[PDB]
Structure formats: structure tokens, C-alpha cells
């Protein structure tokens, strides 16, 4: 799970609209980071680009935290 968390944080830090200092493993995308629907969609697509598995729209809308992302990846292996 540590590797999954590291990969997720690596993807997030590459994103231009994420402030690396303000980023944390429990930072809310909409609230803490102040993003919108399309930015979150792009982030989820970037996560798909890394771990190489399809995340459906219904599941993607429930991935509003980096911790939620790592939990989803771990559950789906």
C-alpha cells in the first residue's frame, strides 16, 4: 500500500493545478485544493494512466480524496 500511495502522490504532484506544499494524503480535491468536476475527472484519468485499469464514472465520482484513491486501487489490486 505504501507503493500505491507513493505512485498516487507522484501523479498528483505532476498535476499543474495541485500545490505540492498544500497537497496531503487527506486533502479534499473540491474543498482543500479548490478544484472542480473537470479537474477531478482529469486527475482520475491520470490515475488510470498510471495503474493501467479502467475506473468507471460511477466509481470515479467517489474518489474525492487521495486516500480514497489509494483505497480504491488497493481494493481492485
Amino acid at each position: 500500500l505504501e507503493a500505491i500511495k507513493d505512485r498516487v502522490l507522484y501523479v498528483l504532484k505532476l498535476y499543474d493545478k495541485i500545490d505540492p506544499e498544500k497537497l496531503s494524503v487527506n486533502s479534499h480535491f473540491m474543498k482543500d485544493l479548490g478544484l472542480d468536476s473537470l479537474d477531478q475527472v482529469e486527475i482520475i484519468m491520470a490515475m488510470e494512466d498510471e495503474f493501467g485499469f479502467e475506473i468507471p464514472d460511477i466509481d470515479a465520482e467517489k474518489l474525492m480524496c487521495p486516500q480514497e484513491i489509494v483505497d480504491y486501487i488497493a481494493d481492485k489490486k
Binding site: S37, L38, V41, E42, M45, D57
Partner: protein, 114 residues
């Protein structure tokens, strides 16, 4: 009143369809830049996709949103099948139009337009 729903019964389903279309358009920009041999960046293409999605952000009618995603899907399939040419893809960018002034003084100097 009780109007016929075209595809979506509520604004949340329309937002879902908008997100699906945005994913489709986002994942096709690299292929479009490669196939059409455009001189723009993939980042520029994605920025244009976001900008075109974002100028309809004021719409609050699920039927208008359904029609917008229908037209967006049609113009996505025109790009994928290479029915469009490089001409149209670059028509999305207005690379030849002069910068239109937006301030009162510049408009007053140029001419009679409001």
C-alpha cells in the same frame, strides 16, 4: 411543465453524460495531434477542449445539456474518423483572426460598433 425528457430526467444524469463526453474528448487529443500532424501541443488541445466545454457552463436545462452532448459526440466522431481535415481542427483556434479590441476607448477609436 411535464416536458418529454430526451435522454436525462434530471441535471445529475446530464452532468454524468457531460463528464463521459469530456473523458472521451480528453483521451482523443493525443491521437488527433498525431494523426492530423498538427503543430500544437497536446496541452493546447486539452486546453481548447476545456475551454469549449466551459463556455456552456451556464446552462441549467437538462434538455439543452443533452443536445449539447449529442452535438459534442457527433463532432468527436467526425474527428476520430478523420472526416474533418486539419483545416477544421485548426478552425477551433482562430489563428488568423485579428485580436478584437474589448475596451470602450479602443472600440471608439476603431469605429461605430457598440
Amino acid at each position: 411543465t411535464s416536458v418529454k425528457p430526451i435522454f436525462s430526467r434530471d441535471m445529475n444524469e446530464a452532468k454524468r453524460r457531460v463528464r463521459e463526453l469530456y473523458r472521451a474528448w480528453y483521451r482523443e487529443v493525443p491521437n488527433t495531434v498525431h494523426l492530423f500532424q498538427l503543430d500544437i501541443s497536446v496541452k493546447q488541445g486539452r486546453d481548447k477542449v476545456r475551454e469549449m466545454f466551459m463556455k456552456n457552463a451556464h446552462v441549467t436545462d437538462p434538455r439543452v445539456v443533452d443536445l449539447l452532448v449529442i452535438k459534442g459526440k457527433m463532432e468527436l466522431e467526425e474527428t476520430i474518423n478523420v472526416w474533418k481535415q486539419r483545416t477544421h481542427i485548426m478552425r477551433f483556434f482562430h489563428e488568423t483572426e485579428a485580436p478584437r479590441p474589448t475596451d470602450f476607448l479602443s472600440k471608439f477609436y476603431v469605429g461605430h460598433d457598440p
